Structure 1
């Protein structure tokens, strides 16, 4: 469909920073776009973590990425989709 398959990363803001750096330096091919480290800005916040979005070409590149990549355990992730539209 018009859903870009993506992975969201929550966790300490500095970790994600470097995780991003790690990803750009060694894994450019395994994903597509990587976001700066953001977070939810209102007091209506569901959590408190920092976040990095990472986008993918195919549900398959995503899945491939996941097998190769050793995500630090202080970092949790979720899978989802957003409109490609918005990249």
Structure 2
């Protein structure tokens, strides 16, 4: 509706980029969009890890992704939402 379900992955950039490659290789059907690697700039930031945002068509698809995909321990993930208007 007004909100798109997302998972944000956080970690060191190369490990994250490796993970992104893996998702694109094997799990393209379990998510919608996936971003390039990014971070929060400047010392005014919540953390300084690299970040990849992955979006889903629905909360069901996000849950199916989380049930299937093995997230490496060195990559943290957080669920949330962003305005669908932003895509």
Q: TM-score, normalised by structure 1?
A: 0.96
Q: TM-score, normalised by structure 2?
A: 0.96
Deviations 1:11-40 (A, max 9, x none): 111011010000011111000000000000
Instruction: State the 4+ residue runs in structure 1 displaced beyond 4 angstroms.
Output: none
The whole-number CA distance in structure 2 between the counterparts of 1:85 and 1:42 is 27
The whole-number CA distance in structure 2 between the counterparts of 1:40 and 1:5 is 21
- Across the aligned residues of Structure 1 and Structure 2, the Cα RMSD in angstroms comes to 0.7
The whole-number CA distance in structure 2 between the counterparts of 1:46 and 1:66 is 24
Runs of 5+ consecutive residues of structure 2 not aligned to the other structure: none
The whole-number CA distance in structure 2 between the counterparts of 1:70 and 1:19 is 10
- What is the DSSP-based 3-state SS (H/G/I as helix, E as strand, rest coil) of the residue aligned with 2:60? helix
Deviation at 1:42, TM superposition (A): 2.1
Residue in structure 1 matched with residue 75 of structure 2 by the alignment: 75
